[PDB]
Amino acid sequence: RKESYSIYVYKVLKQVHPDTGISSKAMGIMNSFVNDIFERIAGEASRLAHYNKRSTITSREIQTAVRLLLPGELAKHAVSEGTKAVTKYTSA
Amino acid sequence: SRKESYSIYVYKVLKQVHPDTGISSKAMGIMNSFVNDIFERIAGEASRLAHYNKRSTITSREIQTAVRLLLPGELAKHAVSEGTKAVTKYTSA
Amino acid sequence: RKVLRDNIQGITKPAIRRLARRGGVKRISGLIYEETRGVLKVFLENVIRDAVTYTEHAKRKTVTAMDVVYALKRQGRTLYGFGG
Amino acid sequence: NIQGITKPAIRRLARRGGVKRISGLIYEETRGVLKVFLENVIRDAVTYTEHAKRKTVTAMDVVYALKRQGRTLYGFGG
Amino acid sequence: KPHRYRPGTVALREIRRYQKSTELLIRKLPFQRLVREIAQDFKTDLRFQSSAVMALQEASEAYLVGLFEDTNLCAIHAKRVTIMPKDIQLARRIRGERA
Amino acid sequence: HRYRPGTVALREIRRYQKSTELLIRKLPFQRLVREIAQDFKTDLRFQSSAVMALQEASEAYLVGLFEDTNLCAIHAKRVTIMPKDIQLARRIRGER
Amino acid sequence: AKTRSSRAGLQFPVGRVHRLLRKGNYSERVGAGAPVYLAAVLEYLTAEILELAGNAARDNKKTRIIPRHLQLAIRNDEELNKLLGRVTIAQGGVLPNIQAVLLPK
Amino acid sequence: KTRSSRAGLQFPVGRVHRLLRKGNYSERVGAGAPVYLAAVLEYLTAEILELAGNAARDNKKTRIIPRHLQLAIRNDEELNKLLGRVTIAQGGVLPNIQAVLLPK
DNA sequence: ATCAATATCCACCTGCAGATTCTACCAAAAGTGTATTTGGAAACTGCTCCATCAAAAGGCATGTTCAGCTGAATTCAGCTGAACATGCCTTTTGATGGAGCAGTTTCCAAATACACTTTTGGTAGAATCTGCAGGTGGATATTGAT
DNA sequence: ATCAATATCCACCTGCAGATTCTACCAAAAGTGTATTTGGAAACTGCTCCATCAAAAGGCATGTTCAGCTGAATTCAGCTGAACATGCCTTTTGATGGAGCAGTTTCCAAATACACTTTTGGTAGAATCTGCAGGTGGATATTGAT
Asked: Which of C46, F85, H35, H80 is 20 to 30 Å from the Cα of B56, by its Cα?
C-alpha cells in the first residue's frame, strides 16, 4: 500500500534527460505536482459536467478543464498531447 | 420548466426574526446565492475530509468538522450548537 | 452589423473619477485614466474568456449570466445576485 | 517561546526577501505575524487530527491545512 | 461672489455621495459595447443575455472600486493624497495580480 | 578594516537568495509550534515531517512577505522596512 | 407523514438538502444526520444575516430589505465580513469610509 | 497490452481511471478521459523535468534537486503563473535585488 | 584613478558517506470477456429572449479657464540601525530505550442504499396589495470671504 | 467672529412597478419492506515519537562607534480641481422578427457490473556514486589614503 507517481516521473525523466537523476526530495516535489494538477483538472471537469447536467466526465470535459486551467501556450500543447493520446488509443 | 430555490425558507426565517420586514427580489437573489455558496463550501470540505479518512460516507460528523474549518469563531460555535441540537432532536424520533 | 472599435474609451474620465470616489479617492493624477482602462480591459478579457469557454463547452451561442458567474467564481471574484 | 525566533534569524529571512535595511520595531512585528500565521495553520491541522481521532499531527494534516489557507506546499505528501 | 468651493471640498462631497449609493457608475450602453468588442475580437457570432452583461458590469465596478481603495492606501503611504499609476501597480503587484 | 554600512547587508542578501536552508533554528521553532498546538488540543504528538512542513511553509511565507514589505518601503522612498510597510502589505493582501 | 424538517425542528428543507448532497458527488454514501445538520447551519446563518440586515433596513427607515442592507450587515460584522471576504454583492455599494488624512486640515 | 502503451504514454491510464472513478467527480467516466488526463499530466511533468534538468546542468549537477525545480518554475512565465500559489519546499527564491538598493 | 592592505570570492582537485540506483519477489490492481443498463445525442418544435429600429429628451461628457495648493526638489543634522570584536550558552545530534499508538484484523449490529407506492410540499403563474422612488419646500447646516 | 451662497436634511405625499397572496398541479419527499455494507469495538503489534544524556560548537546576546538614512522645514512650478458653456449620445419606451434556448421522445454506442486471469508496482535487501565540505592559490572587490 501507498502508491505514488515516482516510477512514471522517472521514466519521463529519462526520456527528456537520460543522463540526469533526481533526489528524493525533488521526487516528492514532482509527486505533489502531479497530485495537485490532477485534482485541479478533475475538480474543474467535475464542475463543468454538473453545470451542464451531465453525469459522465469525458475527454471533452478534461479538455475544457485544461483550457480553463493552463495558461496560453501550456494549454495548447497539453490539448495537443491529450487529443493525440486519445487518437492513438482508439485506433489500434 | 421549474427551478427550485430557497426563497420559501429564507422568507419564513425572515418573518421569525423581523415579522414586520419584507425583502425585495434582488435581496432574495443575494440570499439564494449565499445559501447555495455556503452549502457548496460545507459539502466540499466534508467531501474532502471523508476522502482523507478513506471513508465512503459523509455523516453529521463530517459536516460538523467542515463547519468548524469554514466558519470563524462565534459563527462556528453557534452553527455547531444548532446542528447538534437539530440532529439529536431528529434522532429522538 | 457594424464594426466595434475603441470602445474602451467609452469608459470615460468622469466615470472613472466616480469609481475612485466610491473607492475613497480624493485626488487623481492625470495618467490614472489610461491605467484604469488598461486594467479594466485585462480584467474583462480574463473573465469574458472564461465565460465564453463555458458557453462553447455547452455548445451554445449565447453567453448566459451563469457563464459569467462561473467565470467569476474561477477567477476568485464570486458574485451574488445573478444565480437565478 | 516566540522570543525564541531571534532577531538574527528574522534578519536572515528578510535578507532572502531582498531587504537591505531593517527598522528596530520589525522584529516584534514579525513575531506577531508569524504567530498569527502558525495559529491559523495549526488550528486547522489539529482539526484534521481530532477528526481522524489521532493524537499525532501528521505532515498530511499540515499539508491539508496549508491547502485550505491558500498556501499549498509541495514535497510532504502532496 | 462669484462663490467658489476650495479644491478638495467638492471631491470630499463626491466621495460621501458615492459611498452612500449603490448604482452603477459607468454608463450602460458604452460598457455593453466594450463587452461585445472584447468578446467578439475573441469569438464571433456571440449573443448575450442582458443579465450576463449586468453581471460583468457589477463585477468589474466592484473590482475597480476595491482596487482604488488599495491604490489610495498606497498613495497615502507614500505621503501623497493623489493616486498615481505607480500606486495601482504596487497594489496589483501585492494583490498577486501581476507581481 | 571596516566595511561601510549596507555592504555586508548586500552580501548577505546575495548569500541567502542563493541558498535554500531553513533560516530559523529548528529546536526553537519546534518549541513555538508545540506550544500553539497545545492551546487547541492537549498532549499532542507531532511527526517530525509535520514540523518540517510547518517550518518550510512559515519561512516561505515570511520571505514572500518581506518581499512585499520591501516594495512598500521602496514605494515610500525608503530603503528601511518598517512595521507600517508590513502592515500595508498584509492589508493589500487581504490578510487584514 | 412528518417532514424531516419538522422532526428536526427546522424551517429549511431537510429532504431537499439530502437530495442535493447525494446528487452533488460529494461521497458515495450520505448519513441520515448529514442533511439535518447542514440544513440547520444553513438556516442559522441566513437567520444571522437577516437579523442584521433587517436592522440596517430599520436604521435606514425602510421596511423592505434590499441588497445595500445586506451589504451593510455583512461588512459591519467582523465574522460575516471574514466569511464573505471574497464575495461581492450586486448593488451593495461600499461602507462610508474616508481616510482621516484626507479630511480638511 | 496495458491502456497506457495503447495510448502510447508512460503515465498509468489505468490508475488515472481508478482515481477518477473513486474521487467522487461524477457518476460515470468516459474511456478517453483517463487517457486524455494522463497525457496532460505526463506532458507537464516532461515540461518541468526538461527545464529543471537544464537548471541542474547549468549548475554543474547531474541530479535534479528542489532548488532546480524552483529555478525552472520561477524563470518560466507560464509555469510560474500555474504554480503561483504554490511553494516548493527547499526551493529557495530567485536571486533578485531591487536596483535602488545597489551601491554608488 | 591609483596605491596598498584587508577580506571576499572562485576555481580545481579530492576522499567518503549518505543516498541512489539496482535486484529479487508477492498481493492488489489492471486487463479481459459477457451481459446488462443508460446517459444524452439526433430529430423536431414550442416560444422565451435577444438584436434592432425608431424617436424624443435632457442628463452628462467635453473642453476651456484659472489659480489653489500639492508633489517634487533641496538642504541638513539628529539619531537609528549596520558592522564588529567579545564572551558565553542554547542548539545540535547521536544513540538508547521505552512506549504511546497509528495500522490491521474479525467480527457484525446499526445504518444505508434500493425498488416501489402513496402523499404532499413547491413552483408557476394570476389576483391583490403597497412600500417607497421621485417631487417639493423650508429647516439646518457647511463653507469660505471680510 | 459675522454672514451670504449653497448644499444637505427630513418630513409630508401618492400612484405603480414590484412584492404578497391565492390557486393548481406534480416532481419529489415520505413510508415500507429488504439486501448490503460501514466503520466502529476489542486486541495486538512494529513503529516512529518523546526523553534524557552529553558533550562541543557554532550562533546569539551585548556594548561601541559612527556612517548615512529618514524626516522635518522651505520653495514653488504647474498639475489637477471647480465652474461654465454647449450640445451629443445615452436613456426610455415600444414594437417585431426569428435566433436559438429548452422541452420531449426515441434508443444505440458506450459505460457499468461482475467473474476471473495476469501483470505491474510497492517492499525490503543489495551494489555503486554524485556532491558536500575542505584545501590551497590566485585574482577580486572594498575601503582607507597620495
From this structure: H35
Task: Please judge whether G37 and B87 are an interchain contact, meaning their C-beta atoms are less than 8 angstroms apart.
Answer: yes
Q: Is the CB of G15 under 7 A from strand J?
A: yes
Q: At what angle are helices B7-17 and B25-52 packed, to 10 degrees? A: 110
Choose the mutation target among H19, H20, H22, H24 for the interface with B, i.e. most B CBs under 10 Å.
Answer: H24
A27 is in which domain, residue-wise? 1-92
D18: amino acid identity, one letter: G
3-state SS, residue H5: helix
Distance from C-alpha of E84 to C-alpha of E99, rounded to nearest angstrom: 18
Contact by Cβ (8 Å): G71, G81:
no
Hey, is C60 helix, strand or coil?
coil
Rounded to 10 degrees, what is the CA torsion of H55, H56, H60, H61? 170
SS3 (DSSP) at G66: coil
Round to whole Å and give the CA distance between G4 and F77: 65
Whole-angstrom distance, CA of residue E97 vs CA of residue E89: 9
Range of the domain at F21: 1-96
- 3-state SS class at F73: helix
Cα four-point dihedral sign C24, C30, C33, C39: negative
Cα E99 from chain centroid (whole Å):
21
CB contact under 8 A, D16 and F13: yes
Cβ pair D4, F57 in contact under 8 A: no
For A41-69, b/e burial (b = at least 16 CB within 10 A) is bbebbbbbbbeeebeebbbbbbbbbbbbb
User: Shortest CA–C1' contact from F31: which nucleotide?
Assistant: I91
- Three-state DSSP class for residue C78: strand
Rounded Cα distance between B45 and B39, Å, is 10
Q: Which residues of A touch H42 (CB under 8 A)?
A: 8, 12, 81
Long-range contact set of residues E9-16: C-beta below 8 Å, sequence gap at least 24: E9/G104, E11/C21, E11/C26, E11/C27, E12/C26, E12/G98, E12/G102, E12/G103, E12/G104, E14/C17, E14/C18, E14/C21, E15/C21, E15/C22, E15/C24, E15/C25, E15/C26, E15/G98, E15/G102, E16/G96, E16/G98
Cell of H25: 467527480
CATH number of the domain encompassing residue B71 = 1.10.20.10
- A-chain CB neighbours of D76 within 8 Å are 28, 32
Q: What is the CATH number of the domain that holds D39?
A: 1.10.20.10
A74: part of which helix (H) or strand (E)?
helix A72-91
DSSP string, A15-38: HH-TT-EE-HHHHHHHHHHHHHHH
Instruction: Please report, for the domain that includes residue E59, its CATH number.
Output: 1.10.20.10
CA angle centred on G90, ends G86 and G93, rounded to 5°: 85
Within 10 angstroms of residue A13's Cβ, the number of other Cβ atoms is 24
Residue span of the structural domain in which G52 resides: 1-105
Distances (CA, A) of F4 to F10, F74, H103, H104: 11, 21, 11, 12
Could you check: is the Cβ of residue E85 within 7 Å of any atom of nucleic acid strand J? no
Quote the number of domains for chain D.
Answer: 1
CA torsion F44→F47→F49→F54, rounded to 10°? -10
Single-letter amino acid, residue B50: A
Q: How far is CA D50 from CA B42, B82, D58, F42, G46, in A?
A: 18, 21, 11, 11, 28
**Run of H or E including E85:** helix E85-94
Residue-number span of the structural domain to which D34 is assigned? 1-78
As a whole number of angstroms, the distance between CA H17 and CA A32 comes to: 19
